Design an enzyme around this catalytic site. Structure first.
Site, PDB file in Angstrom:
ATOM      1  N   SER A 258      38.289 -14.110  68.340  1.00  0.00           N
ATOM      2  CA  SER A 258      39.182 -14.228  69.476  1.00  0.00           C
ATOM      3  C   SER A 258      40.576 -13.769  69.083  1.00  0.00           C
ATOM      4  CB  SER A 258      39.201 -15.678  69.954  1.00  0.00           C
ATOM      5  OG  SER A 258      40.152 -15.879  70.980  1.00  0.00           O
TER       6      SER A 258
ATOM      7  N   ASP B  56      19.613 -22.024  72.322  1.00  0.00           N
ATOM      8  CA  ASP B  56      20.623 -22.275  71.300  1.00  0.00           C
ATOM      9  C   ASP B  56      20.978 -20.979  70.590  1.00  0.00           C
ATOM     10  OD1 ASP B  56      22.234 -23.272  69.354  1.00  0.00           O
ATOM     11  OD2 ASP B  56      20.646 -24.291  68.206  1.00  0.00           O
TER      12      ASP B  56
HETATM   13  N1  LIG Z   1      25.266 -29.489  66.853  1.00  0.00           N
HETATM   14  C1  LIG Z   1      24.483 -28.565  67.196  1.00  0.00           C
HETATM   15  N2  LIG Z   1      24.824 -27.269  67.182  1.00  0.00           N
HETATM   16  C2  LIG Z   1      23.828 -26.570  67.733  1.00  0.00           C
HETATM   17  N3  LIG Z   1      23.855 -25.265  67.903  1.00  0.00           N
HETATM   18  C3  LIG Z   1      22.696 -27.449  68.083  1.00  0.00           C
HETATM   19  C4  LIG Z   1      21.445 -27.230  68.631  1.00  0.00           C
HETATM   20  C5  LIG Z   1      20.629 -28.338  68.813  1.00  0.00           C
HETATM   21  C6  LIG Z   1      21.050 -29.611  68.455  1.00  0.00           C
HETATM   22  C7  LIG Z   1      22.309 -29.825  67.903  1.00  0.00           C
HETATM   23  C8  LIG Z   1      23.116 -28.721  67.717  1.00  0.00           C
END
Ligand SMILES: N=C1N=C(N)c2ccccc21
Ligand SMILES: N=C1N=C(N)c2ccccc21
Ligand SMILES: N=C1N=C(N)c2ccccc21
Ligand SMILES: N=C1N=C(N)c2ccccc21
Ligand SMILES: N=C1N=C(N)c2ccccc21
Ligand SMILES: N=C1N=C(N)c2ccccc21
Ligand SMILES: N=C1N=C(N)c2ccccc21
Length: 330
Positions: free
Chosen positions: A199, A35
């Protein structure tokens, strides 16, 4: 050092991607959601409330001879989708695709919210945003990438997400066979802790490119592409029958449609997202209304270049002294 690991969609819609990660000694392999929009490495664990575990693989620190409880340290995170988790902290050895960090903070979940429990495919998160967002208290901890950076051949990692197919995360090197043409690099602001960039504009299908600055984040942990309402309206106006549905929570469109592509600018370069990448399938099982992959950011306060955008590109997260992002077509 370098590392290379395959990342795989969790389902047939590419709702998220999981990558195997080795934790502890002997290794315990968990499938984590890498992430770039957060900065905690957290896992389902032997300490997670039993009723909140439903099929996930757990980390058991007591079985790891290299695990050490980090005394008094706790963590708690809430994500943009409304989900959350919290717990205690160990340090342990963590390896990704052959790259090893000793002493990595591994955040063990004691509690997770229902969406995490309900998803048996994700055993935790591996955050790859900047360590300033890490939630451990009272002593903030560093991400896997931050801890690895000085050991790497080059202080970078790359995301090469597949469309309905596996892809690759690489650490420490750029696979020059994995993209076409050149990589265009663009400036990053780290002020909010994200891989935040601007962007240079967009186009819908074969339409005229609109030069306009769109500040947003490169976020592998967000599924969809969240952009300003004007841009999103211009996209869906090209799809007969598409509309924004308050009851569904976004733009929906007839499942019989073939969608136009969407182009975004990176400097003078252009990344083209094929139309099919924007189709997230029936809103509910058996429906002929389908959920769109481009949605308005108006209610979330930041534009998000999530997986819909990133999987159309080979993406370099350059963690040098002054970070930058690179994008190439592929
Ligand atoms: N909505 C999210 N945005 C993220 N970067 C994320 C990571 C893990 C669960 C949910 C999310
Ligand atoms: N010197 C130590 N560092 C740590 C630790 C844990 C348990 C016993 C001794 C030590
Ligand atoms: N940039 C750094 N982040 C932290 C740390 C510890 C030791 C050397 C350099 C760094
Ligand atoms: N030498 C370092 N550069 C950076 C970093 C993060 C954590 C520990 C050591 C370092
Ligand atoms: N995965 C699919 N299942 C369908 N029935 C369908 C129709 C059009 C595009 C993709 C799909
Ligand atoms: N029934 C479908 N119609 C689509 N356009 C689609 C996309 C992905 C999965 C399933 C479907
Ligand atoms: N938020 C959503 N609402 C839906 N009906 C849907 C389908 C596929 C992915 C995400 C969503």
């Amino acid at each position: 050092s370098t590392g290379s690991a395959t990342t795989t969609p969790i389902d047939s819609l590419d709702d998220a991607y999981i990558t195997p990660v080795q934790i502890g000694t002997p290794a315990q392999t968990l499938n984590l959601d890498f992430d770039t929009g957060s900065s905690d490495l957290w896992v389902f664990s032997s300490e997670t409330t039993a009723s909140e575990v439903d099929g996930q693989t757990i980390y058991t620190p007591s079985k790891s001879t290299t695990a050490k409880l980090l005394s008094g340290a706790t963590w708690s995170i809430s994500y943009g989708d409304g989900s959350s988790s919290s717990g205690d902290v160990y340090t342990d050895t963590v390896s990704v695709g052959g790259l090893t960090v000793t002493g990595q903070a591994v955040e063990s979940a004691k509690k997770v919210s229902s969406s995490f429990t309900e998803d048996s495919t994700i055993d935790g998160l591996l955050g790859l945003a900047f360590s300033t967002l890490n939630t451990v208290s009272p002593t903030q901890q560093k991400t896997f990438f931050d801890n690895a950076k000085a050991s790497l051949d080059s202080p970078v990692f790359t995301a090469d997400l597949g469309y309905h197919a596996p892809g690759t995360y690489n650490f420490g090197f750029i696979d020059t066979t994995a993209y076409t043409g050149s990589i265009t690099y663009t400036a990053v602001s780290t002020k909010q802790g994200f891989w935040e960039w601007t962007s240079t504009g967009y186009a819908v299908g074969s339409g005229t490119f609109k030069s306009t600055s769109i500040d947003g984040i490169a976020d592998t942990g967000t599924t969809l592409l969240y952009l300003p309402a004007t841009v999103v309206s211009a996209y869906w106006a090209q799809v007969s029958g598409a509309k924004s549905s308050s009851s569904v929570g976004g733009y929906v469109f007839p499942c019989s449609a073939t969608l136009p592509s969407f182009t975004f600018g990176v400097g003078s370069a252009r990344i083209v997202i094929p139309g099919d990448y924007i189709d997230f399938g029936p809103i509910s099982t058996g429906s002929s209304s389908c959920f769109g992959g481009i949605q308005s950011s108006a209610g979330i306060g930041i534009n998000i270049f999530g997986d819909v955008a990133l999987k159309a590109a080979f993406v370099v997260f350059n963690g040098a002294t002054t970070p930058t992002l690179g994008f190439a077509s592929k």
